[PDB]
Nucleic acid binder design. Structure first.
Ligand SMILES: [Mg+2]
Length: 1260
RNA sequence: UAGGAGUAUCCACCGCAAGA
RNA sequence: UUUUGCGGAGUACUACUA
C-alpha cells in the first residue's frame, strides 16, 4: 500500500541564474536556424541539388513502368454481363488468333487464345456458370478458369513461363531531354484521358453538381476507362481466389477490344502473393504507355498493344478497384474548393483535366510517387511561409531516385510550382498544381496537394525492406545515447548537468541531455499556475484508479496486442492483453490494485517490440508493443500526469479529440484580440508602437528518440499537487525510474531476414552490434513513442512558460504576448512584438541608450524582436531534450498550422478528404447493416468537418453503390432482395438488404438506420389504417430479425473470420461450468467483476464468446473486402448456426413472414418501440420534411469558418448476492460552420440546408 | 527485370505418385 | 533442373480522445 520511497530533494536553483545566463546568451550574435524564402534562393537550391544528384545514383537510359493496368478505350463502355462476356471473348480470341506473335509474351497470349477458342462446348457451358451449375469437364476445373498444360505451349511461351518462375538507378533529371520526354508522354496520357467519347436535396444536386460536374465527366474517356478498370479488377479479384489462382483464364470487355489474360499465380489470400496478368488492347486514346508496352502487334489498320506481365499485390488491386470512385471523390472535393475560392463554377476544361490527373494518380499506385507527394505536402507550407527550413526539405526531395517517367513529370511540376510560389511572396495568388487557374486562398492549394496525396493507399512499402527501417531510428539514437554516456559520464547524463556546467561547456545544451536547474525552474513556473487550482488537482488525481482493482477496466482487458514472455528462442512472444490478464490472474491469489501490481512487478525489466503502423508517409513509423509490467508503470505515470494535464490550459493532448479545434481557435482569437491597439513604452512620456503577431508552426525533431526520460523525474519531484503527503508523487517517481531502461527486441521478420542475409555488408553489422545476443538490446533514456504522450506535452508547456517568465524578466519595459499550444511533438507558438512607427528613430535611440546603460542583451531587440524571441525559446527548450526541427517548422505572419489543420486568422480549414476517401477503402465486415452504417457514418463526419451537402451526398451514393456491389445487394445480382422477398427492394429491412440510399440530411440529423426505422413506422401505419397483408408481411421480417456496429434489430454474423485454433485459456473451464455460472450471476454481463475467481470466470467466458473471438482473428483490413467480393455468390449467411448462402436466409424470412400472424404482445412491443425510443429521431425527420427552401439572388461569398458543438444501475436491478452488491456499488460531435452560424442544435441543421447551393444563397 | 520494392541481399507457392 | 496425374495454401495491427 504505497510503499515508502526516497523521492528526490529540490536543488533550489534561482530563476535569476537563468536570467543572467540568458542575458549573456543574448549579448552575442546568434545565427538564425531558418532561411528566408526567396525565388532566387529556391532556384539556387533546386539548381545545386539537380547538379549534385547525378553523382549519387547510377545513370539509367530506360525509364521504368509506372502504370499498373494499361488499357485503351475508343467507344462507350457498358458494364460487363456474363452474356456480354462470352461473345466478347469469342470475338477477342478470333482477333488475337488472326494476329502474329512477336515476343514471348505475345506467344503466350496467342497460345492462351488458341486454347480458349478450342475449348469444347461443354466447358463453355460450365464456364461462365455459378457453382451450382458447374461440373468438372477435364478442361475447366473452376467456374471461370481453364487449364493450359506446358505441352499445350510453344517454345517461346514456356520460355516466358521460365522467366516468370525463375543496383538502383535514377533517370538523369538534370538533363533537358529526359524532362521533355517525360512531360510530352504524360501530357499525351492526360490529353487522351480528357477526350470525349462518342426533394430539395435532389433538386439542388441536379441543379448545381450533377449539371456542372457529373454531366461534364460522363463524356470523358477517363470515366469509361475507370469503369473498364473496375471491371478488370473485379475479374482479377474473382480469379484470385484460393481455388481459382491455380489455373489460367481469359476475359474480354468492350466488344472484344480489351482482353485480360490471367496467368497462374499465388492466391491473394496468402501473404506475399501477386496476381500475374497480361492485357491486350487496340492502340488508341487511353492509359497507354507505348514505351513500356511488351509488344505492339500490327494488323491491317490495327495496332494491338500487349502490356508486360504485370504482378499486382492485393493492396494495389483493391486500390485500382475503387480508382474511379476515388478520382470522382477527389474531383468533387476540388470542385467544391474551387467554388468556395473563386465564387464561380469551374470551366469545362479545368474540371476535365483535374479529373484526368486524379484518375491517373489513382491508377499509378507506386511508393515513389507517394513519397514525392508526402514531401510536397510539407514543401508547400515551407515556401509560402515567411521563414522556413526549405533547403533541408528540398534536399530530402532530391534524396530519392527518379526511376520512373511519372516521377520526372511530377518533379518538374513541383519545381515550377515552388519557384512560382516563392517568387510571389508578400488574398494573394497561389497557382494550382494540376490546373492552370490560380487560387486566392492558400487553403485551396494545400488542399489540392493534400487531396492528391491521399489518393495513394496505405502500406505501399516493401514488406521486408521497411521492416528493417523502423528499427534504425531507435537503434541509432540508442547508440548516440551510449556515446553520450561514455563521453560525458553516466551520472551526468541520467541526472542532468547543472547550470554552471553548461556555462563552462556551452556545448552541453544538446538533445538527450537536460539541465537540472531548467527542469526545476519549469516545474516552478507550472506550480505558479497550479497553486490556484491545487484543490482541483488533488480531486482529479484522487479520481484516478489508484485504489480500484486492476484488470477491471476496459484498457487492462481488451483485444489490443501485448508482448508476452521471452520464448525459448529468445524473441518476445506476442499475445492479446486479455490473455496476459488471465494468465496473471490464474497465477495470483487475488485481484491486485494498480499500486499493489506495481509493487509486485517493479523489479521486472521493461521490454518492447516495434511493429509497422502501415502509414502512407515517405518512411513508415513503428509503434511499440510493451509487456505487462511496462504497461502498469506507463499507466501509473500517464494517469498521474493526465490528472494534472486536464487542469491547465495550453495543454491540448489532454483535451478531447474534438475540443482541440475549439480551444486552439479560442487561443488564436485571444491573440488577435491582443493585436488590436497600440503599446506605449516609457522613455523615462511614451513612444507608440504597433502590435504585430507572428505564428510559428513548430514540430520537434525527435520526440521519443532524441529524449531523456529521466528529465520527468526531477520534474515530478517538483510538480505541486493538492495531496497532503508526497507518497503518490514518490510512487510516480519510482515508476519513472523503472521505465528508464527498456529491452528493445528485434522483430521476428527482421531476425529471419538478417539470418538469411548470407553477406553482412556494412551498415548492417553496425545495426546488429546493438543486439549482443542477437535478439534484444538495452535502450536507455528513450521512452517508447506513444507512451508518456501527456507527460511530455506537460513538460513542453512547462518549458514554454519558463521561457515566457525569462523573457518577461529580461525586458520588463516591453509588453509582449505569448500564446503556446503543445500537442506532443506538434506545437504552435504565437509571439507578439512591437514594431515601431515612422522608422522608430526614437526606438533606435532608446535601444542605444539602454545598451549604453549597461544592458548588453538589448542587441537582440532593435530590429525583428520575434527572431530573438524564437532564438531564446528554442534555446530554453533545448535546455530540456526538446529540439525544434529546422526542417518542418514554418514562421508566418498570417497563416499557421496545428494538429494537421490550417488556420488563416480565425478561419480553420479541416481537410475532409481524409474522411471521405476513408469511407471507401475499408469496412468492419460485421454485417451488411454494420458495413452500410460504417460507410454512411464516415460521410456524416465529413459533413461535420466541412464537406458540402452535395459532395457528401455524392460520396454517400458512391459508398452505397460500392457496398451493394460488394455484398451483391444491388439489383441484378445474386443477393437481390426483390427476387426472394416479395418487395419492391425499397421496403426491405436494411439488415436483409434493400435500398440503403438515403438523404444525407436524414443521416446527419435523424440517424443512420433511420430508413429501417421509417419502414417499421410506415408498416405499422399500414397495419393501423388498411390492415394490408404487405404491411403485415413487412412486420414478419422484423420479428424474424429479432429471433435471429450499431445496436438495433439486425440479422448474427456476416463476418466469416473464425479462428484457426483455440486460444490459450479458452478451455480453462468446461462449457457447462460457464453456462451454469452465467445464469447464477446474471448481472456480470453488464459490469466487470472485482473478485479474482469471478473475474477469471468472466474473462474465460469472454474468451469463449464467438463475438469476441471473431474480432481477435481479424487483424489485416481489406482481406474481408477481397473475401466478400470473391464469394458474395455463396458460403455465408449464419442461418440457424450454419454457413449457407444468404438466399436461404431470404427464403426463410419469406416463409416466416408469410406464416406469421399478429399477436397482442408483438404488436404492442412494436408500437412502444417505434413511439418511445425514436421519439427524437422521428421529430428530426419531421423537422426536415417541415422545412422549405427558396433561392434569392446573391452570390455566396464564404466567410471565416468556425467550429461548434452538436448537442451501472442495471446491475443493481438483477443483483442478488452481497459480492454482486459490492461490485455494482463500486462500479457506480464538433462541426465546422460559417461565422454567422451559432451553436444551437438546430442552427447547424439550418446552415446545412442553407449551404445546399454552392453559388446561390438560399433562405430557410 | 516480366512485375512490386529498393542506394537492406526480399517477394514473386506447397506436398505425393508416376515417367526421363 | 523438368513432364503428366492429383491434392491443397484464410491474411503482426500499440497507450491517445471524444
Ligand atoms: Mg505542426
Amino acid at each position: 500500500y504505497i510503499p515508502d520511497y526516497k523521492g528526490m530533494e529540490p536543488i533550489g536553483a534561482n530563476i535569476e541564474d537563468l536570467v543572467d545566463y540568458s542575458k549573456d546568451w543574448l549579448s552575442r550574435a546568434r545565427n538564425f536556424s531558418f532561411f528566408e524564402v526567396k525565388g532566387t534562393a529556391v532556384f539556387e537550391c533546386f539548381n545545386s541539388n539537380e547538379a549534385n544528384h547525378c553523382q549519387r545514383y547510377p545513370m539509367s537510359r530506360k525509364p521504368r513502368n509506372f502504370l499498373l493496368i494499361q488499357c485503351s478505350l475508343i467507344t462507350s463502355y457498358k458494364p460487363a454481363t456474363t452474356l456480354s462476356d462470352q461473345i466478347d471473348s469469342r470475338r477477342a480470341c478470333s482477333y488475337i488468333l488472326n494476329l502474329i506473335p512477336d515476343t514471348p509474351a505475345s506467344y503466350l497470349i496467342h497460345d492462351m487464345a488458341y486454347r480458349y477458342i478450342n475449348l469444347t462446348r461443354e466447358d463453355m457451358i460450365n464456364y461462365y456458370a455459378p457453382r451450382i451449375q458447374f461440373k468438372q469437364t477435364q478442361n475447366v476445373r473452376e467456374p471461370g478458369t481453364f487449364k493450359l498444360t506446358s505441352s499445350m505451349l510453344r517454345a517461346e511461351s514456356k520460355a516466358m513461363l521460365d522467366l516468370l518462375n525463375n543496383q538502383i538507378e535514377s533517370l538523369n533529371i538534370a538533363s533537358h531531354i529526359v524532362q521533355s520526354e517525360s512531360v510530352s508522354l504524360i501530357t499525351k496520357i492526360l490529353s487522351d484521358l480528357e477526350l470525349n467519347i462518342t426533394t430539395v436535396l435532389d433538386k439542388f444536386f441536379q441543379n448545381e453538381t450533377q449539371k456542372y460536374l457529373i454531366d461534364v465527366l460522363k463524356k470523358t474517356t477517363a470515366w469509361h476507362i475507370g469503369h473498364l478498370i473496375r471491371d478488370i479488377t473485379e475479374s482479377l479479384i474473382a480469379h484470385s481466389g484460393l481455388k481459382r489462382s491455380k489455373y489460367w483464364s481469359l476475359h474480354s470487355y468492350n466488344n472484344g477490344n480489351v482482353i485480360l489474360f490471367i496467368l497462374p499465380s499465388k492466391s491473394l489470400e496468402v501473404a506475399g502473393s501477386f496476381i500475374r496478368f497480361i492485357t491486350v488492347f487496340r492502340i488508341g486514346p487511353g492509359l497507354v504507355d507505348k514505351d513500356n508496352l511488351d509488344t505492339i502487334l500490327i494488323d491491317g489498320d490495327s495496332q494491338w498493344g500487349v502490356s508486360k506481365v504485370m504482378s499486382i499485390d492485393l493492396n494495389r488491386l483493391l486500390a485500382l478497384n475503387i480508382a474511379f470512385e476515388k478520382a470522382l471523390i477527389a474531383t468533387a472535393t476540388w470542385f467544391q474548393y474551387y467554388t468556395e475560392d473563386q465564387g464561380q463554377f469551374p470551366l469545362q476544361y479545368a474540371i476535365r483535366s483535374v479529373f484526368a490527373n486524379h484518375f491517373l494518380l489513382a491508377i499509378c499506385q507506386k511508393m515513389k510517387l507517394c513519397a514525392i507527394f508526402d514531401n510536397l505536402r510539407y514543401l508547400i507550407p515551407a515556401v509560402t511561409s515567411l521563414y522556413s527550413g526549405f533547403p533541408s526539405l528540398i534536399e530530402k526531395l532530391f534524396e530519392r531516385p527518379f526511376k520512373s517517367s511519372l516521377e520526372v513529370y511530377i518533379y518538374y511540376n513541383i519545381k515550377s510550382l515552388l519557384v512560382a510560389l516563392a517568387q510571389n511572396n508578400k488574398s494573394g495568388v497561389y497557382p494550382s498544381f494540376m490546373s492552370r487557374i490560380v487560387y486566392k486562398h492558400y487553403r485551396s492549394l494545400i488542399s489540392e496537394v493534400t487531396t492528391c496525396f491521399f489518393l495513394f493507399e496505405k502500406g505501399l512499402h516493401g514488406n521486408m525492406n521497411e521492416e528493417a527501417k523502423i528499427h534504425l531510428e531507435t537503434v541509432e539514437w540508442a547508440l548516440k545515447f551510449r556515446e553520450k554516456e561514455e563521453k560525458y559520464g553516466e551520472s551526468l547524463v541520467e541526472n542532468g548537468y547543472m547550470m554552471w556546467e553548461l556555462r563552462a561547456n556551452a556545448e552541453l545544451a544538446e538533445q538527450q541531455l537536460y539541465c537540472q536547474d531548467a527542469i526545476e525552474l519549469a516545474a516552478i513556473e507550472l506550480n505558479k499556475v497550479l497553486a490556484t487550482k491545487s484543490s482541483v488537482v488533488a480531486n482529479s488525481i484522487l479520481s484516478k484508479n489508484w485504489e480500484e482493482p486492476y484488470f477491471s477496466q476496459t484498457r487492462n482487458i481488451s483485444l489490443k496486442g501485448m508482448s508476452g514472455q521471452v520464448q525459448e528462442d529468445g524473441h518476445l512472444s506476442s499475445s492479446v492483453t486479455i490473455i496476459e490478464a488471465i494468465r496473471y490472474l490464474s497465477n495470483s491469489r487475488h485481484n491486485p490494485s494498480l499500486l499493489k501490481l506495481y509493487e509486485e512487478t517493479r523489479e521486472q525489466k521493461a521490454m518492447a517490440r516495434i511493429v509497422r503502423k502501415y502509414q502512407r508517409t515517405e518512411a513508415d513509423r513503428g509503434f511499440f508493443i510493451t509487456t505487462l509490467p511496462t504497461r502498469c508503470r506507463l499507466e501509473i505515470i500517464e494517469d498521474y500526469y493526465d490528472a494534472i494535464a486536464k487542469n491547465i490550459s495550453e495543454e491540448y493532448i489532454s483535451y478531447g479529440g474534438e475540443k482541440k479545434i475549439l480551444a486552439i481557435q479560442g487561443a488564436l482569437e485571444k491573440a488577435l484580440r491582443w493585436a488590436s491597439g497600440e503599446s506605449f513604452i516609457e522613455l523615462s512620456k511614451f513612444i507608440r508602437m504597433k502590435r504585430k503577431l507572428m505564428y510559428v508552426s513548430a514540430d520537434a525533431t525527435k520526440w521519443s528518440p532524441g529524449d531523456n526520460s529521466a528529465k520527468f523525474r526531477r520534474f515530478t519531484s517538483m510538480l505541486h499537487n493538492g495531496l497532503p503527503n508526497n507518497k503518490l508523487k514518490n510512487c510516480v517517481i519510482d515508476a519513472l525510474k523503472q521505465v528508464y531502461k527498456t529491452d528493445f527486441f528485434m522483430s521476428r521478420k527482421l531476425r529471419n531476414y538478417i539470418d538469411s542475409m548470407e553477406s553482412l555488408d556494412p551498415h548492417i553489422k553496425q545495426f546488429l552490434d546493438f543486439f549482443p545476443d542477437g535478439h534484444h538490446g538495452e535502450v536507455k533514456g528513450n521512452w517508447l513513442q506513444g507512451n508518456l504522450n501527456k507527460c511530455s506535452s506537460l513538460f513542453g508547456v512547462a518549458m514554454s512558460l519558463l521561457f515566457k517568465q525569462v523573457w518577461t524578466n529580461l525586458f520588463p519595459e516591453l509588453d509582449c504576448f505569448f500564446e503556446f499550444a503543445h500537442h506532443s511533438d506538434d506545437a504552435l507558438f504565437i509571439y507578439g512584438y512591437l514594431e515601431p512607427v515612422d522608422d522608430g528613430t526614437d526606438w533606435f535611440l532608446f535601444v542605444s541608450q539602454q545598451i549604453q546603460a549597461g544592458h548588453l542583451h538589448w542587441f537582440s531587440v532593435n530590429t525583428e524582436m520575434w527572431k530573438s524571441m524564437f532564438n531564446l525559446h528554442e534555446h530554453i527548450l533545448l535546455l530540456g531534450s526538446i529540439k525544434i526541427s529546422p526542417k518542418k517548422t514554418t514562421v508566418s505572419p498570417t497563416n499557421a498550422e496545428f494538429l494537421s489543420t490550417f488556420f488563416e486568422g480565425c478561419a480553420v480549414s479541416i481537410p475532409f478528404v481524409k474522411i471521405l476517401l476513408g469511407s471507401l477503402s475499408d469496412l468492419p465486415g460485421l454485417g451488411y447493416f454494420d458495413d452500410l452504417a460504417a460507410a454512411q457514418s464516415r460521410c456524416v463526419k465529413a459533413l461535420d468537418l466541412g464537406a458540402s451537402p452535395q459532395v457528401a451526398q455524392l460520396a454517400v451514393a458512391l459508398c452505397t453503390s460500392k457496398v451493394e456491389r460488394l455484398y451483391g445487394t444491388a439489383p441484378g445480382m445474386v443477393n437481390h432482395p426483390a427476387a426472394y422477398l416479395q418487395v419492391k427492394h425499397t421496403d426491405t429491412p436494411i439488415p436483409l438488404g434493400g435500398n440503403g440510399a438515403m438523404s444525407i440530411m436524414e443521416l446527419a440529423t435523424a440517424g443512420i438506420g433511420m430508413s429501417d426505422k421509417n419502414l417499421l413506422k410506415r408498416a405499422l401505419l399500414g397495419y393501423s389504417h388498411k390492415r394490408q397483408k404487405s404491411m403485415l408481411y413487412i412486420l414478419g421480417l422484423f420479428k424474424f430479425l429479432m429471433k435471429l456496429g450499431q445496436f438495433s434489430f439486425i440479422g448474427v454474423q456476416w463476418k466469416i473470420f473464425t479462428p484457426k485454433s483455440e486460444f490459450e485459456f479458452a478451455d480453462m473451464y468446461t462449457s457447462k461450468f460457464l453456462e451454469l455460472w452465467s445464469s447464477q450471476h446474471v448481472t456480470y454481463d453488464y459490469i466487470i467483476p472485482k473478485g479474482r475467481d469471478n473475474l477469471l470466470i468472466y474473462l474465460v467466458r469472454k474468451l469463449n464468446d464467438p463475438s469476441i473471438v471473431t474480432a481477435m482473428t481479424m487483424q489485416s483490413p481489406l482481406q474481408l473486402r477481397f473475401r466478400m467480393q470473391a464469394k458474395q455468390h455463396m458460403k455465408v449467411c449464419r442461418l440457424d448456426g450454419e454457413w449457407v448462402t444468404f438466399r436461404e436466409v431470404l427464403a426463410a424470412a419469406n416463409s416466416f413472414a408469410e406464416n406469421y400472424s399478429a399477436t397482442s404482445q408483438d404488436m404492442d412491443l412494436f408500437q412502444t418501440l417505434t413511439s418511445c425510443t425514436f421519439s427524437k429521431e422521428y421529430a428530426w425527420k419531421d423537422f426536415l420534411n417541415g422545412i422549405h427552401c427558396d433561392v434569392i439572388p446573391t452570390k455566396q461569398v464564404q466567410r471565416a469558418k468556425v467550429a461548434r458543438t452538436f448537442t451501472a444501475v442495471i446491475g443493481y436491478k438483477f443483483a442478488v448476492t452481497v459480492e454482486e452488491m459490492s461490485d455494482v456499488l463500486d462500479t457506480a460531435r464538433v462541426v465546422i460552420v460559417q461565422g454567422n452560424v451559432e451553436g444551437t442544435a438546430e442552427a447547424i441543421c439550418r446552415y446545412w440546408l442553407k449551404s445546399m447551393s454552392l453559388v446561390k444563397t438560399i433562405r430557410v
